[PDB]
Design a protein around this ligand. Structure first.
Ligand SMILES: *[C@@H]1O[C@H](CO)[C@@H](O[C@@H]2O[C@H](CO)[C@@H](O)[C@H](O)[C@H]2NC(C)=O)[C@H](O)[C@H]1NC(C)=O
Ligand SMILES: *[C@@H]1O[C@H](CO)[C@@H](O)[C@H](O)[C@H]1NC(C)=O
Ligand SMILES: *[C@@H]1O[C@H](CO)[C@@H](O)[C@H](O)[C@H]1NC(C)=O
Ligand SMILES: *[C@@H]1O[C@H](CO)[C@@H](O)[C@H](O)[C@@H]1O
Ligand SMILES: *[C@@H]1O[C@H](CO)[C@@H](O)[C@H](O)[C@@H]1O
Ligand SMILES: *[C@@H]1O[C@H](CO)[C@@H](O)[C@H](O)[C@@H]1O
Ligand SMILES: *[C@@H]1O[C@H](CO)[C@@H](O)[C@H](O)[C@@H]1O
Ligand SMILES: *[C@@H]1O[C@H](CO)[C@@H](O)[C@H](O)[C@@H]1O
Ligand SMILES: *[C@@H]1O[C@H](CO)[C@@H](O)[C@H](O)[C@@H]1O
Ligand SMILES: [Ca+2]
Ligand SMILES: [Ca+2]
Lengths: 40, 487, 88, 393, 482
């Protein structure tokens, strides 16, 4: 949150910011395919 | 750390013995002259050198096996033990080619717990079982029914009695000391006239507090008693075979290896137990100072004011627990930092029945095993072994080891001295601690070997070892000088 | 079965205090003087010992270590543990 | 800015390999692609068929007096006729009729899955425990009964494993560190936790290895002539290394970090950042995927969740760490040109060390540093710098 | 923090080949581990040791190499005659039971039978291939009582809750002289706390004013907790050793002439050391240390006013369980309690670890074998080890930040840091005021020598310790027989 205010005329302002990140990984398994004598 | 490590030294070699008539080898040895310590490099070399021979002196090594030769182990067994349905040779040899087998034990029968552990000789100086000397799997017929609780047991032929002898001690102490002090001193002075005035103040506090709590609780539980027979013993074959490999000539190195492999003394009477020692030791201190002063003058005017306030609090606490018999689930929960709830204590003692340590033990020198019914030229092997045993005690006794810091204890396993560190100090020499000082317990240097015959003397000193540096404990456990007849 | 159990405890505390006040004045130009002093000193000490020493002969190995585990709250013995020792 | 894939030309054709009936050359990657320019894929080795220019040698490669199994793998008659099926293709019924029973005379015993996966291959790309070069279903006709691990039940240990010692360890390492300052005010936090459980360690035998029928025959298939593509194809399908020993277990790790500040005319500012992560490996799904979540939140854990999670590692471990051995040490001598295969596996691994070098990619902007991924050099950065090259904020 | 010193790995140029030894059927050569990588830089494609097939200059020697008794032709072991047809498998070929009544296999091998038979590596702390034969019995039926056997079972058919007959006995391997089964534990605990505060003022006024104030508050906690438990202890034999068959053949395969490669390979495969004795245990250590501090000061005069506060908290916490079940060592890792200790202890019944042990350098094994003296080989094996403990040594693995362990993984070093990623600059959370020791730089090679002088040298570390950090056990020079 950010605020700026002044007088001489009256001036006021505000800013507000949010950021979120979440992830979750549930790994089951992994593989590699035979690069010779492959059956198609 | 204030160190420069000590690397091992063995001596320059002995001369060779002449060739042994019966072992057909010759031997050379060195004394251990300085042990490895502060992680200085080992030089162990297994403490010996040996060579083959070409001499032709007569030998009488054929002491007759009267019964049956155990083909692999070189044991002899009396003829009533062949085909008894039991392994009397070690390698099952005695039960070969049995035209019938006769059983004796009518029921299953446990070995008494640790009875094979008691079968091994001790190095009395490290206080350690080294290796196997009497065959606690030998039953000579036997099969007499023995009971503990409702469990039934088989007694090794070597053992006179294993019996519960079921005794227990608890000893407890708790101590508190406390002391308190508080002092307050003040001054005030004033003057005025109509113009001038003056004022002065001091207030003070000094304060102190101290406490100790000390608690010790020890239990000794003694729920078996072992006594070995005096003689007519049946040896473990691995011991018997190094004994048949000893020279009749004297050269200390081959005899030294028997004490390394099989211990210096055999265990003849022992009480078998659990111990549960607990100690909790606490020292606590607090202090304060407060001080406050003012001065004033008036005429125009001036003020001065000061405060100085201070506090300290500390605890040092140590706890040690040692437990020496039982089963690992109980043993860990007893070993926990909290004073054991009596259920734990119950289940621990119940398991001490099934796995004891030795509490107190009376031991005999191993040469009383060496016997004319078991070895050729036995009496020479005895006299040799007696001399070697005395020379070995001079090697294994800890006295060579340079003193530990922090009141650490040396035990000199193998050919290295390692300082066991108490609670509250750490590192190779036990130097590293937060604490200011520690009381030191005394031990001598190695004793001077002998003076001349016609009245003979041995002498000891404590020059580095002594208690007075940093206000230590007891200096002594025996005689600061020693003398005897030559014969 | 045997017990010895002994508890012994002591306290002292002390306070001492001393003071003075003095005053003088003159007039015809007015003028006065005052002096005041105070001291307080206090000392206190405590001590406690407990020793307790249950000893047992006969009993099952666990029941022995059960009964002989000293209770600060019951120095003679917990009645059920004691009865269990007396069984074992 | 973004950069596309770049490669060498295609090297000049090999001559025709007599027994393999093929011919190839290769193409080095120069740049994999960078900063989301067009990412590389295209082949480093590719090949054409040939009717060979000279005769192939005699095809048999039998180790002398050894028994020629249907695999074509070197074995001795004790391994077949004792019914154990060591030679790699379950042939024992062909070999003996009388008393061919397994080496455990009466006391037949279960295998172990934790033993079978011993000697995983490993590759510097992805660091994957590739399925075993070793044939841990060869037992050398041994009965070889362990009773180790927490199931309190006997198992036969495989020939290529010197021991699978279940030398248990459980360790938690924990640190926290916090600070405060004021004149304005500042507040700072760091937290680290890891927990490791080692169920056991396997060591692979350093002589007399039995390899899978596929591993040995898939080196028979090599070029014999130093051609990258076929050597790389053996690497990328069996490893750059094998795990010559390693530690089976489970692991968790956590972090929390916070960093916080606060500071006519009216001026003020506030600044804050947050970072939290959780990792879990090993154990069965229900307990692991409970706990990895559960520990990211503040929750004061039931010790029984730790007991259940780490108990399940007995049934489902992960490799925590291991001793890498360069893979070519598994071409058994008493095979035709065995050493020339070793030599050029090592030269192909040296060629592996040449092109996958990240160092030649271009500099990331601002406070960043470069990483390599499958077809991209890229970066990620402090101080709120943004984009795949960190050029902006 | 200091910049990294990452470098690509180097092996040496190759040595010339050894000649084609009969029976071995092999040429060998080596590279000298010239410089395995510092903590960063890409690994060597190559390796230290090589074998290649070759036909021999003469015909292979017969099993008369064993002398007057049997040898299993397809493997190493020379056997005493009684082992042929004893009813038990004495060699890897099994021919000692071919073409022909021990029941002692009724009892499982003693817990630790493996890890005590395996060699050991003082340069990496790893095990190695079997040195002793973990399963050799020599025909002995030597049983050992299990002092931990006691475990509960319940029987629904007869209403007994009672302790099971399982695990009561183990068969001892012939290579263990004794293995004892006595129950012990020992725990040592410290707590120390220190706590301090100071508060001070002064003021002057005249008719000017000045006022000053200072505050400090501090706390320390240390504790160490150590436990050891033992279920048994053991000592290996020092005469008539039966080697592992793998060791035995890998030894016979060594050259009578001194060439470094084959002896370095046997060192690397069978280990720098062999375990002479050990203890089988569970150790739990726990260590917990805390510092805190808080300070303030004020100053006022006329006027203007200023104030500041600074405060710290830091905690180091370790929990480590060796031995026990995977489950309960997770329990006792995560939490210290009367819960986690008791079940951990129950799991030490089943899964112990070797907690502490004593050892000898590998060449001493040979003299204690049934093979008779091998003095030429034994000296070559020593002569190679006397280079090896310089060449393969973790001393070369260089700077580790934040007290990290330097270890050589085969041909490549790691610095296992206790926080952060490995290698240089392991910290970014800790300040540059952090405390870490100085620890050894390596041995030199054996220096140039004179009739009464030869030297080998060390440095306590290359840099000074980080801030108030500790230092090495203290050496600069060691000496040799020239
Ligand atoms: C000097 O005078 C001050 C009087 O206030 C005494 O200080 C107090 O003493 C009483 C009685 O012991 C305590 O209950 C108060 O807490 C004290 N106040 C403080 C914080 O100073 C002090 O005793 C005097 N010194 C003497 C006795 O000479
Ligand atoms: C504070 O905020 C007010 C809001 O109107 C503004 O008028 C003033 O100029 C700012 N400065 C002050 C009052 O400190
Ligand atoms: C273990 O958990 C208990 C019960 O919640 C708690 O009292 C204790 O402080 C914990 N101990 C440790 C070491 O976390
Ligand atoms: C015996 O011991 C000395 C001391 O090292 C050596 O010079 C030599 O081995 C001698 O024979
Ligand atoms: C030297 O002599 C005696 C032998 O009676 C030793 O026991 C002791 O060490 C003394 O100093
Ligand atoms: C030869 O190599 C070029 C690369 O310069 C390819 O474009 C072409 O297809 C052929 O393989
Ligand atoms: C071993 O190393 C040399 C350099 O010493 C190379 O020419 C070649 O790799 C040889 O095999
Ligand atoms: C330095 O340290 C090792 C370990 O003791 C020695 O064996 C060797 O001399 C090395 O140079
Ligand atoms: C230095 O590193 C440690 C600390 O002394 C030791 O284990 C070793 O002696 C080495 O030289
Ligand atoms: Ca018999
Ligand atoms: Ca046999």
């Amino acid at each position: 949150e950010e605020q700026i205010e002044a007088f001489k005329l009256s001036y006021s302002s505000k800013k507000e910011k949010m950021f979120l990140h979440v992830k979750g990984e549930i790994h089951l398994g992994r593989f590699v395919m035979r690069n010779r004598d492959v059956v198609l | 750390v204030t160190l420069m490590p000590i690397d091992c030294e063995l001596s320059s070699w002995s001369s060779w013995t002449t060739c042994d008539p019966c072992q057909k080898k010759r031997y050379r040895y060195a004394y251990l002259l300085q042990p490895s310590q502060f992680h200085g490099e080992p030089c162990n070399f297994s403490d010996k050198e040996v060579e083959d021979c070409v001499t032709n002196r007569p030998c009488r090594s054929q002491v007759r096996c009267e019964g049956f030769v155990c083909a692999q182990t070189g044991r002899c067994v009396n003829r009533r033990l062949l085909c008894n349905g039991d392994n009397d040779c070690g390698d099952q040899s005695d039960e070969a080619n049995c035209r019938r087998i006769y059983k004796k034990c009518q029921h299953e029968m446990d070995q008494y717990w640790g009875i094979g552990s008691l079968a091994s000789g001790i190095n009395l100086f490290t206080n350690s079982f080294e290796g196997p000397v009497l065959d606690h799997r030998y039953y000579a017929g036997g099969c007499s029914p023995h009971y503990i609780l409702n469990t039934r047991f088989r007694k090794p032929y070597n053992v006179e009695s294993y019996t519960p002898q079921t005794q227990g001690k608890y000893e407890f102490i708790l101590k508190e000391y406390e002391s308190y002090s508080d002092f307050e001193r003040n001054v005030t002075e004033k003057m005025a006239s109509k113009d001038r005035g003056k004022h002065y103040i001091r207030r003070t506090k000094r304060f102190s507090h101290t406490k100790s709590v000390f608690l010790h609780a020890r239990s000794d539980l003694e729920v078996a008693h072992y006594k070995l027979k005096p003689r007519s013993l049946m040896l473990h074959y691995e011991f018997l075979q190094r004994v048949k490999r000893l020279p009749l000539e004297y050269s200390y190195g081959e005899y030294r290896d028997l004490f390394r492999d099989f211990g210096t003394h055999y265990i003849t009477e022992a009480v078998l137990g659990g111990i549960y020692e607990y100690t909790l030791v606490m020292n606590k201190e607090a202090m304060e100072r407060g001080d406050y002063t003012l001065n004033n003058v008036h005429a125009r005017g001036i003020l001065n004011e000061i405060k100085d306030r201070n506090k300290r609090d500390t605890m040092v606490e140590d706890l040690v627990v040692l437990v020496r018999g039982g089963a690992s689930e109980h043993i860990t929960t007893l070993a926990y930092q909290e004073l054991p709830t009596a259920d734990l204590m119950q289940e621990w003692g119940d398991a001490v029945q099934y796995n004891p340590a030795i509490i107190k033990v009376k031991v005999e020198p191993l040469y009383e095993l060496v016997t004319a019914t078991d070895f050729a030229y036995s009496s020479t092997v005895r006299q040799n072994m007696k001399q070697a045993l005395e020379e070995f005690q001079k090697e294994v006794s800890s006295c060579h080891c340079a003193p530990c810091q922090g009141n650490g204890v040396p035990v000199l396993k193998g050919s290295r001295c390692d300082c066991i560190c108490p609670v509250g100090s750490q590192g190779l020499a036990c130097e590293v601690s937060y604490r200011k000082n520690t009381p030191i317990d005394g031990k001598w240097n190695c004793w001077s070997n002998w003076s001349s015959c016609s009245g003979r003397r041995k002498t000891r000193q404590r020059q580095c070892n002594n208690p007075p540096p940093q206000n230590g404990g007891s200096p002594c456990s025996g005689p600061a000088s020693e003398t005897l007849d030559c014969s | 079965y045997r017990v010895l159990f002994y508890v012994d405890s002591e306290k002292l505390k002390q306070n001492d205090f001393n003071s003075v006040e003095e005053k003088k004045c003159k007039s015809s130009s007015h003028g006065c003087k005052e002096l005041e002093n105070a001291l307080k000193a206090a000392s206190g000490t405590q001590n406690n010992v407990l020793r307790g020493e249950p000893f047992i002969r006969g009993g099952g190995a666990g029941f022995i270590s059960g009964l002989s585990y000293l209770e600060l709250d019951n120095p003679a013995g917990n009645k059920r543990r004691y009865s269990a020792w007396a069984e074992s | 800015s973004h950069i596309d894939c770049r490669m060498s030309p295609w090297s000049e054709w090999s001559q025709c390999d007599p027994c393999l009936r093929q011919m190839f050359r290769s193409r080095s990657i120069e740049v994999f692609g960078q900063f989301n320019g067009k990412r590389c894929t295209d082949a480093v080795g590719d090949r054409r068929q040939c009717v060979p220019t000279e005769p192939c040698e005699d095809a048999e490669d039998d180790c002398g007096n050894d028994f020629q199994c249907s695999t074509g793998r070197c074995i001795k008659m004790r391994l077949r006729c004792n019914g154990d099926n060591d030679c790699g293709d379950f042939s024992d019924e062909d070999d003996c009729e009388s008393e061919p029973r397994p080496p455990c005379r009466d006391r037949v015993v279960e295998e172990s899955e934790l033993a079978r996966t011993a000697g995983y291959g490993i590759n510097i790309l992805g660091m994957d425990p590739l399925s075993t070069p070793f044939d841990n279903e060869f037992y050398n006709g041994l009965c070889n009964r362990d009773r180790d691990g927490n199931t309190l039940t006997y198992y036969r240990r495989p020939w290529n494993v010197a021991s699978l010692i279940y030398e248990t360890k459980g360790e938690k390492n924990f640190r926290t560190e916090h600070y405060e300052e004021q004149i304005s005010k500042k507040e700072k936090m760091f937290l680290h936790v890891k927990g490791e459980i080692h169920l056991g360690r396997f060591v692979m035998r350093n002589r007399d290895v039995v390899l899978t029928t596929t591993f040995v025959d898939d080196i028979k298939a090599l070029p014999t002539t130093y051609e990258k593509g076929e050597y790389f194809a053996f690497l990328e399908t069996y490893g750059t290394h094998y795990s010559s020993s390693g530690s089976l277990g489970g692991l968790y790790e956590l972090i929390y970090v916070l960093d916080k500040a606060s500071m006519a005319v009216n001026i003020t500012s506030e600044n804050l950042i947050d970072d939290v992560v959780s990792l879990i490996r090993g154990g069965t799904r229900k307990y692991a995927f409970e706990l990895k979540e559960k520990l990211l939140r503040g929750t004061v854990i039931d010790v029984t969740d730790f007991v259940n999670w780490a108990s399940s590692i007995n049934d489902a471990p992960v490799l925590i760490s291991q001793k890498l051995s360069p893979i070519y040490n598994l071409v058994p001598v008493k095979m035709k040109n065995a050493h020339l295969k070793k030599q050029n596996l090592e030269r192909a691994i040296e060629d592996y060390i040449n092109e996958f070098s990240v160092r030649k990619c271009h500099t990331c902007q601002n406070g960043g540093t470069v990483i390599l991924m499958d077809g991209k050099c890229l970066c990620a950065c402090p101080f709120k710098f943004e984009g795949i090259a960190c050029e902006i904020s | 923090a200091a910049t990294p010193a990452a470098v690509t790995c180097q092996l040496s140029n190759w040595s010339e080949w050894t000649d084609c030894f009969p029976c071995q059927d092999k040429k060998y050569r080596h590279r000298s581990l010239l410089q395995p990588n510092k903590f960063g830089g890409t690994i060597c494609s190559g390796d230290i040791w090589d074998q290649a097939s070759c036909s021999s200059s003469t015909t292979c020697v017969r099993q008369a190499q064993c002398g007057q008794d049997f040898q299993c032709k397809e493997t190493g072991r020379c056997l005493k005659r009684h082992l042929v047809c004893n009813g038990d498998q004495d060699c890897l070929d099994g021919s000692d039971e071919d073409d022909c009544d021990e029941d002692c296999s009724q009892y499982e091998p003693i817990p630790g039978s493996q890890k005590a038979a395996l060699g050991y590596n003082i340069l990496t702390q790893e095990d190695a291939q079997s040195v002793y034969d973990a399963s050799y019995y020599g025909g002995q039926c030597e049983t050992v009582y299990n002092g931990e056997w006691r475990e509960l079972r319940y029987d629904s058919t007869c209403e007994r809750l009672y302790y099971g007959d399982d695990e009561k006995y183990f068969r001892k391997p012939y290579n263990f002289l004794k293995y004892h089964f006595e129950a012990l534990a020992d725990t040592g605990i410290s707590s120390e706390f220190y706590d301090n505060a100071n508060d001070l003022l002064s003021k002057v006024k005249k008719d000017f004013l000045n006022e000053l104030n200072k505050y400090n508050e501090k706390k320390f906690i240390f504790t160490r907790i150590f436990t050891k438990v033992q279920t048994a202890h053991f000592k290996m034999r020092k005469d008539d050793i039966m080697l592992d068959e793998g060791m035995l053949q890998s030894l016979m395969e060594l050259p009578d002439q001194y060439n470094y490669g084959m002896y370095a390979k046997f060192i690397n495969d069978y280990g720098t050391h062999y375990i002479t004795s050990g203890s089988m245990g569970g150790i739990y250590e726990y260590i917990l240390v805390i510092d805190k501090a808080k300070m303030e000061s004020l100053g006022i005069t006329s006027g203007k006013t200023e104030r500041a506060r600074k405060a710290m908290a830091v905690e180091d916490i370790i929990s480590r369980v060796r031995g026990g079940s995977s489950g309960w060592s997770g329990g006792l890792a995560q939490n210290r309690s009367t819960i986690t200790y008791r079940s951990w202890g129950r799991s030490l019944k089943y899964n112990p670890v070797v907690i502490d042990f004593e050892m000898q350098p590998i060449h001493e094994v040979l003299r204690h074998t049934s093979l008779g003296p091998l003095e030429a080989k034994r000296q070559n094996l020593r002569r190679a080890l006397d280079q090896y403990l310089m060449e393969f040594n973790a001393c070369r693995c260089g700077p580790c930040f934040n007290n990290g362990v330097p270890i050589l993984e085969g041909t490549s070093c790691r610095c296992q840091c206790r926080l952060g990623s490995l290698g240089a600059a392991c910290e970014q959370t800790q300040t540059e005021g952090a405390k870490a020791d100085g620890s050894w730089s390596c041995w030199s090679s054996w220096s140039v020598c004179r009739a009464g002088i030869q030297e080998r040298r060390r440095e306590c570390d290359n840099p000074a310790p980080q801030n108030g950090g500790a230092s090495c056990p203290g050496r600069k020079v060691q000496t040799q027989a020239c």
